Amino acid sequence: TSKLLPGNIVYGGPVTERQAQDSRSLGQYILDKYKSFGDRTVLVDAVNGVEYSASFMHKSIVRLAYILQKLGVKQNDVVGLSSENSVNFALAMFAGLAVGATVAPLNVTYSDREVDHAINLSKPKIIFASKITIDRVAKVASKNKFVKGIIALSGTSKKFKNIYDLKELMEDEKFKTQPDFTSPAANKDEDVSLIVCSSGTTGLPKGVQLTQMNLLATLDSPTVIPMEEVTLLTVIPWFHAFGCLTLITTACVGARLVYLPKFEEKLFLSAIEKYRVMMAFMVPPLMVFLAKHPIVDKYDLSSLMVLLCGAAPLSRETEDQIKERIGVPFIRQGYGLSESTLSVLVQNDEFCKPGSVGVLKVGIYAKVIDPDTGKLLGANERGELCFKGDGIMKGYIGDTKSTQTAIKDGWLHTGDIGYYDDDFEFFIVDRIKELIKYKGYQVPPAEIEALLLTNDKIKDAAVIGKPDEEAGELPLAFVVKQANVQLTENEVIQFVNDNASPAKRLRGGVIFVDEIPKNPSGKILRRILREMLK
Ligand SMILES: CCCCCCCC(=O)OP(=O)(O)OC[C@H]1O[C@@H](n2cnc3c(N)ncnc32)[C@H](O)[C@@H]1O
């Protein structure tokens, strides 16, 4: 029930439920939820086929929570998490939240300098790490005195002084703990539950701080199905806000959360078939895969009911394609930023126009402002989207300048161009910083990208501005064709020439490639793309 308030501000409605917010801390709300689920399955390791009960989660969170306190972790301390999706990941995060510590997950594919830059943003006192990243993490922690200890969820290393094996700690008979642990009370308004590293044009990430309030208010907020009885698959990485908050919310609703370490084409399809996955979180890259890759037909996907996509531009042409190929009833697209905790806009049964991002979630205000002025725009006027509500981040840790630039008067200036129609359904056009500056025009690469993805001969597409002396930027398309097909640069140029405005002309040419660089969250790594121009 969105409302158009005076002044051209859109409102998603008042937040009715207050269960999570009433809690004394996110750690206590998670523990009680898990305990209240009894012995039901809540986590399924798809690769190894191991079901995990709610009581197993509760017991392990209690044990690990005590161990953290013994190791010196105190309320509002920071603990790092560098690991693929796994039960130990969830156990590590929940335990850290149980003791009232900030959890700072770290991208698993990070490099020495990115890892070093991340842990220098949040300054974790203890860091969890699996075998895939322990060597890099231990090596980096050596050059940072604030890191007092590393816990290895798997594997080992000698490049750091104080390393603990999680298995030995959990099982230490000499360390006696009670069957139940209770989380301390949090200043929900200021205590930081999560520090999520966001990608930016800087090349190095910023640390967005999400308070307990941000998370509890989000918890208190797509289809008519009760999520509790849902078998849910999440391939988005859990160190990203989308996958991270999706793991928490799904956990609090008692759903059956199936997971893979990362994403893999065959493992993804295989998981949906074996475990009868009914709903899955996706990023556009996976949606395009479902829509294009021929391997998709080699699997039984009948159990799939809902596809929840977000994090990057997704066109209706791709949505329709997927629905017409595999026959999934519900495809819902959502929009949000790391700075907005989770989504601020989601499609539903009533507001699910093709290619839209839905309507505001309760408690969130939205406004479309014209850049180069604060002019608040009306319906159907494109402008920079700004959001206000209980989901807005507290700010970039240690970077008050970047925070003032982003949050004005409680409004998050997302930096994206969008608009809302007369039903207050929102549409995301593109990111201002990624608009191709060609002869004063601000061409949205996402528009051309959607057009190129309608061509059955194109498997993936990414458009970038090519540096030019007179024009400044010329649209250039990185194209990934399908296997058994013939495609030429001229044919691609002709395609957009006959279906797009003269400004979208691929004057920069075509550059066929077998794979487009994407980040673990499905965002086109434009930075890398501009480097390949050779
Ligand atoms: C249920 C939905 C859960 C979504 C959570 C993901 C949060 C996240 O993505 O955090 P990030 O900070 O990494 O991304 C922030 C930036 O990503 C771009 N963006 C994000 N969503 C869309 C979209 N639906 N359509 C077009 N663009 C999108 C945009 O430009 C934005 O400013």
Numbering used by the authors: 2 to 222, 226 to 538
Copy out sentences from the published article reporting this entry, exactly as the authors wrote them.
The fruit fly Drosophila melanogaster expresses a long-chain fatty acyl-CoA synthetase (ACSL), CG6178, which is 41% identical to Photinus pyralis firefly luciferase (Fluc). Insect ACSLs are promiscuous enzymes, recognizing a variety of fatty acid substrates. However, unlike fireflies and other bioluminescent beetles, nonluminescent insects such as fruit flies do not biosynthesize D-luciferin, which is required for light emission in beetles.6 Moreover, despite its homology to Fluc, CG6178 has been shown to be incapable of adenylating D-luciferin, and does not emit light when treated with d-luciferin and ATP.
Here we report the crystal structure of CG6178, which shares the same overall fold as firefly luciferase, but has a steric protrusion occluding its substrate binding site. 534 out of 544 residues in the CG6178 protein sequence were resolved in the electron density. The first methionine residue, last six residues, and a section from 223–225 were not resolved. The addition of ATP dramatically improved crystallization, but surprisingly, density for ATP is not observed within this structure. No fatty acids were explicitly added, but CG6178 is known to accept fatty acid substrates ranging in chain length from C8 to C20.2 The presence of octanoyl-AMP (C8) and an ethylene glycol in the active site is most consistent with the data. We hypothesized that fatty acid substrates can readily traverse this narrow constriction, whereas the relatively bulky d-luciferin cannot, or at least not in a conformation suitable for attack of its carboxylate on ATP during the adenylation step.
